Ligand binder design. Structure first.
Ligand SMILES: [Ca+2]
Ligand SMILES: [Ca+2]
Length: 313
DNA sequence: GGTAGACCTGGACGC
DNA sequence: GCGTCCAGGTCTAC
């Protein structure tokens, strides 16, 4: 069989993971600005690269159905399904988090009723780092294209489904290579093309390579966030996205225009310790602290729910 | 130390 | 049709 698979077309090639919609809604997570590597190639079926292999995912009321494209088609093995469980951090019980947040935040409770299943993906540091470097002063649709062209040009070719060729995310070496910036500009990444080249070189030639980034996962939020900000193209918001989505800092709250609108419209929030009236390094930091005092240790996760809901509105 | 102004790109809107 | 806005912001002279 050729092309992207559907649960109905190739039954024997799918394996499931127990998962109710209250725990995960692919349609509210995958195209919402966390990861830019997933596409709904066929109604309700999402395809993308996960743990260096291509996968298609789809769900029914109580199951998350998975299929992987590696030779000789066969359903995913238990070890491979584990990769999926970990990518979606399925050990974190979303129902428990929603309950808590909703208990201390009447507005969250209201929104939560209509937007269940919004959880945080646990992403690869490099993929997350450069994808978000590409996200600044930009929109999800455009960002998604940039990331795809980036991987196509500098990432390992994996497999082809229909007319779509999947690529693994580029390595630091590839991104640090000669003339990467110029090539990325022709691929339409704008001024961020330099940020990509410059940051790849900085990590490899000034910070000590991959080890420096990966170690941030063991470091403290304050530690990690400060470290990331030295990288070209990485500001407070991008750094926060990375901490939350790739370095296991569930309290990190990225503050962008969306979160500002939410704060003002749904909580009548306004800076008090800062000086400005709108977004600024001072007010942004304050808003982040506000969201943390409101939701607690997993504030970044709560923010993700409202962000996702704000997109679909 | 804290501020607006510029900035690649392309889909939206309003004149 | 076409100039101003804006999107998961960051980087800088005054
Ligand atoms: Ca903006
Ligand atoms: Ca920086």
């Amino acid at each position: 069989e050729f092309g992207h698979r559907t649960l109905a077309s190739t039954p024997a090639l799918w394996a499931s993971i127990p998962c109710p919609r209250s725990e995960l809604r692919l349609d509210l997570v995958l195209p919402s600005g966390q990861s830019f590597r997933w596409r709904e190639q066929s109604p309700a079926h999402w395809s993308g690269v996960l743990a260096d292999q291509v996968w298609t995912l789809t769900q029914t009321e109580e199951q998350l159905h998975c299929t992987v494209y590696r030779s000789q088609a066969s359903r995913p093995t238990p070890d491979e399904l584990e990769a999926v469980r970990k990518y979606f951090q399925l050990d974190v019980t979303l129902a428990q988090l929603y309950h808590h947040w909703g208990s201390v935040d009447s507005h969250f409770q209201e929104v939560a009723q209509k937007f269940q299943g919004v959880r945080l993906l646990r992403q690869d540091p490099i993929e997350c780092l450069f994808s978000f470097i590409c996200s600044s002063n930009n929109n999800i649709a455009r960002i998604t294209g940039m990331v795809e062209r980036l991987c196509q040009a500098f990432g390992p070719r994996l497999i082809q489904l229909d007319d779509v060729t999947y690529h693994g995310f580029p390595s630091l070496q590839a991104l640090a290579g000669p003339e990467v910036e110029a090539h990325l500009r022709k691929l339409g990444l704008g001024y961020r093309a330099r940020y990509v080249s410059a940051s790849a070189r900085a990590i490899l030639e000034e910070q000590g390579g991959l080890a420096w980034l990966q170690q941030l996962r063991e470091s403290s939020y304050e530690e990690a966030h400060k470290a990331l900000c030295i990288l070209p193209g990485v500001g407070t918001q991008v750094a926060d996205c990375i901490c939350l989505m790739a370095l296991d800092k569930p309290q990190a709250v990225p503050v962008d225009v969306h979160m500002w609108h939410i704060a003002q419209r749904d909580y009548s929030w306004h800076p008090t310790t800062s000086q400005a009236k709108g977004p600024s390094p001072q007010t942004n930091k304050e808003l982040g602290n506000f969201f943390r005092s409101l939701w607690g240790p997993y504030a970044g996760w709560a923010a993700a729910v409202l962000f996702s809901a704000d997109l679909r509105q």
